Symmetry: D2
Subunit: 278 residues, 4 copies
């Protein structure tokens, strides 16, 4: 019964509240139904999980925009809670970002992130790098132009592990001024790190913590402007382990995250990158 637009209103309501919320990992229609049934307030479609499902591949931007959108569209037919799409770098330059936004808003997603990582991996650079802030600003501005339903939330994402706090403040302030509805940060260490970045932000914050034990004080998160916390996709690795255990028993022939990692053939992709990209 909630439409794509109504789901966007619900998400905005979470953001205007004075609490933060932990996302359920929602990657397909079954998991979306599960999350809603357990009473989760919002979910997240991760780019990493889409890449496991479509391709059994590492999180290397191998999936195409169409493939990511098919995943989102399948979730959008059944989702009764608002779903955030991790939309990587927008699948190209700022013109590709427009299309990312059109496709995902139509798929029925409640909110999406665009991040300023230089993707896909560059020739010879075994470093993960960020695009210049000027490019990043144009991508956020491009995303906001492409939006049709103004209830859609556009979250600018950056990586605070890569760069120093003063560059994170600079970029995130620039994205706020560009019109971002929220700021998403990955790589934040602890509360001192967070307070330094949160100080000059007045739009809601989204945190990708991957179960960081030094960011478990939710009351403190919320009063620093954090509304959404993402801990990762254990629920997907648990499904992979279950499938394996069942088949292994049927046959008579590693943790869950190690098992999921193994089936991405990381060594094969690592050999290709060495042989063709360095």
């Amino acid at each position: 019964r909630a439409s794509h637009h109504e789901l966007r209103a619900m998400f905005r309501a979470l953001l205007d509240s004075s609490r933060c919320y932990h996302t359920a990992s929602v990657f397909d229609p079954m998991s979306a139904r599960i999350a809603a049934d357990l009473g989760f307030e919002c979910g997240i479609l991760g780019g990493s999980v889409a890449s496991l499902q479509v391709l059994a591949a590492p999180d290397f931007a191998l999936i195409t925009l169409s493939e990511f959108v098919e995943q989102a569209t399948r979730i959008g037919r059944v989702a009764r809670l608002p779903v955030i799409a991790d939309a990587d770098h927008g699948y190209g330059n700022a013109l590709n970002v427009m299309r990312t936004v059109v496709e995902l808003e139509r798929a029925g997603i409640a909110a999406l992130t665009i991040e300023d990582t230089l993707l896909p991996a560059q020739f010879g650079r075994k470093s993960t790098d960020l695009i210049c802030v000027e490019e990043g600003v144009g991508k956020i501005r491009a995303a906001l132009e492409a939006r049709v339903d103004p209830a859609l939330t556009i979250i600018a994402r950056t990586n605070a592990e890569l760069i120093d706090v003063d560059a994170v403040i600079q970029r995130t302030l620039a994205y706020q001024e560009a019109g971002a509805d929220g700021i998403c940060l990955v790589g934040v260490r602890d509360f001192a790190h967070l307070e330094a970045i949160a100080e000059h932000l007045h739009i809601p914050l989204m945190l990708v913590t991957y179960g960081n034990p030094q960011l478990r004080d939710d009351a403190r998160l919320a009063r620093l402007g954090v509304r959404v916390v993402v801990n990762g996709h254990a629920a997907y690795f648990a499904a992979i382990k279950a499938t394996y255990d069942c088949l292994r028993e049927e046959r008579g022939a590693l943790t869950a995250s190690e098992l999921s990692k193994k089936y991405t053939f990381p060594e094969e992709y690592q050999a290709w990158a060495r042989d063709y990209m360095e």
Copy 2:
């Protein structure tokens, strides 16, 4: 490194052997990779698991042929064991059948089954199309084939119709040139034995863990090469996802089995309500 054609050769080799093999449930790339790691000889992409994956929907012919093919294509990019696709009734009449063969063969599947169930549910029951129509769908499938190593398997339902009629159909399909026969609903080694008698092509059983059919040396002797135990591996995954999120939430979780859980999130009463409302 094995091509789509080589996997067809490997599957034919199993059918020519003296043994019968038990499929792994293979519904996506991760599962295809797990099945091969575990040493399975062949895999099976069931229409019902595609329906849960794409739609969280019951096994009601709701997925389009393109969706079903998308699932098969994703598998074909990684599969190192031959995989059988359950292709339902071939997604329409005999001319639609030719498209399903073309689509699934290109996606890289090793064998497919075409069943004579009248799908989708007619405005009735689980009926069967006439034997003449079924023969013509099989001849059409075999025509549509390009790679001759591709195995075309003709499927019928034995649970309902009397064994004469099953003997009747399956003989006609054998006559029409099918590479093998797929049987669902066989009761026991006696019932198998009857249908098996006048057949010289490989047999495939969808038993669903039927306890009365567990002798592999004996199924083989009778001409069975492939046994499909079901899709518990898929339910395990749903349960596991549910359990992890339920723990994360601090909610207090069901006492449903992996299968009752899977069925629940298929919303079967909505679909049952719509059928009663719009198709009665």
Copy 3:
């Protein structure tokens, strides 16, 4: 600028005018942009043409719902005029009909037709018959239930050619009863025929005439309640002929004397599909 919802308001606003409208054939992004630039009020995405573009195939329900929705989706990204999708039989029973509406409404189309033709062609029966009126009413009800944006127009279509006029009036009334926003008619012979049918409908009418000279009168049509007229897909066949003639001239080959419709039919390989239908679908 105009959103999928605003296009639906425009289409509703046409159906509530006292005027008749002639569709442009809108089959892809470029044709949609052409048709808007020319001032057309609405377009139609025909299933026959989707089948030409996707498959080079006759109009035999060979294309999948997904393929058809992909065509609608492409159009939806550019369309500044409202577009009607010919959704054939809803790609299955009433359960499939519901998916058909969900998919096409999400694609962005302003209106869609569900017809009561028995599809795909069934075994033995060399003619193409209609589902019983009750399966028809169940289909139409399921379509309306599946709709989310109430501004989406759901149109019930039937064939006024084979079955006698009374059987027709019966079907249309039941559809109108069932809650259809409009009726679509194929194979109306003439105004005598139309008037019989128009008489006890009060919901907007749409006509697929195929150029029928007996129905050429717009003021009259509108007074009878017709709001949309589909003349066909000549603009697609013109594209086929232009591609043929350009390549023929680059090659240095002799001219063909087939017309644009003739060339388009030829490239569907109709004889091949016929041999298969005789070989595999007749006793």
Copy 4:
């Protein structure tokens, strides 16, 4: 009748002959059926034409690999002549190239081109810049590794317009050494330009000429190793103009003055895409 594999052998036999062949523009199943009926030896699916068909958009790498592949798949269900796919840069880095080859091969294409253009366009940087030759070699070697059917023809494409002859010579030799099956060249000026680049190649050449009148001589081209000429995608433009002409006369509008190509460009909304590039991809 001809399988995807059989089509590749037919393509290879063109390459092995002593003649140059002119592609038909083949962008969907009806056009593939037309080209075959007319007796064309081979066809070409242009990425530019895919962008017009899927998006009504200019050739700006806006189409996804999945969209390109769907176009190529439609064609592959009916093609009776070998079709070359213009695969742009492989839709990302060398690892994306692998997937490009996988998808188009399975689609049933006879041959594909991978170009060393830096794509998509860079924030301010320059839309026609090339990647370094080392990255180009890695992309070519990745395509060749990704190939399953050995009959598939893999062509390394470069742009001779803006870089110097010695640089084209360097890149083409290195793609030849990397094992490319052919070399495709866009932006060749004339026979002297061509002769310099052709001189140290021994694999078949493909030329994208865009009607360049300084390169019209089949015998003379074939003697330099040219096997395939792509003259452009006029046949698509003609199909657009025909649709325009038909609806406009249906409407009662005045006849258009614009050529087929002018009218096709108009409906890509070039000014809109240009304004967006200005506003979002240039320093403020």
